[PDB]
């Protein structure tokens, strides 16, 4: 009985370990990915604002 219970406990511990490593690596990749999107969207919004401001000033200069 000792062998069965002890090996069961060890197997459960190992399973938790492996799956936690997998999930944490996935989280790291996701973190890099979100870091990228932040700058992407910031630059997009800045450029659209700049372009539309140019549009307003040009159209008002012509009218």
């Amino acid at each position: 009985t000792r062998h069965s219970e002890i090996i069961k406990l060890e197997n459960s511990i190992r399973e938790l370990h492996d799956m936690f490593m997998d999930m944490a690596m996935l989280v790291e990749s996701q973190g890099e990915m979100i870091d990228r999107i932040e700058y992407n969207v910031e630059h997009a919004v800045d450029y659209v604002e700049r372009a539309v401001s140019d549009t307003k000033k040009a159209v008002k200069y012509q009218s």
Binding site: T1, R2, S4, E5, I6, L9, S12, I13, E15, L16, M19, F20, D22, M23, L26, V27, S29, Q30, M33, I34, R36, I37, N40, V41, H43, A44, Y47, V48, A51, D54, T55, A58
Partner: protein
């Protein structure tokens, strides 16, 4: 406790991620409509009993409790993992969209400057 906090806050992150995806889709649709309009404008024990004694009991009982808790963790942990996977995909799906959006305005602006002269 750390496990539970992780689960709840992961749920919140998923909600926020869905919200941003919806907002981005709305932005894309509005941008396309505006551009088109503008173009149209133109278990029995755990320790052997060598001497028995009270000391050998609590030990075993502790182990028992330990085992039970471990069980819970398994299910707990497994569940959490699933969530992350979904988020991964959704996160990817936004970049492309957003990227395309950005590209559009660029060319649009370029066109807005090329028709004039």
């Amino acid at each position: 406790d750390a496990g539970i906090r992780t689960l709840v806050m992961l749920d919140e992150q998923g909600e926020q991620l869905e919200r941003i995806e919806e907002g981005m889709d709305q932005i894309n649709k509005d941008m396309k409509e505006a551009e088109k309009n503008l173009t149209d404008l133109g278990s029995g024990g755990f320790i052997r009993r060598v001497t028995n004694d009270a000391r050998e009991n609590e030990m075993d009982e502790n182990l028992e409790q330990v085992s039970g808790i471990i069980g819970n963790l398994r299910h707990m942990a497994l569940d959490m993992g699933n969530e992350i996977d979904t988020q991964n995909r959704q996160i990817d799906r936004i970049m492309e969209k957003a990227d395309s959006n950005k590209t559009r305005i660029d060319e649009a602006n370029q066109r807005a400057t090329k028709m004039l002269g």
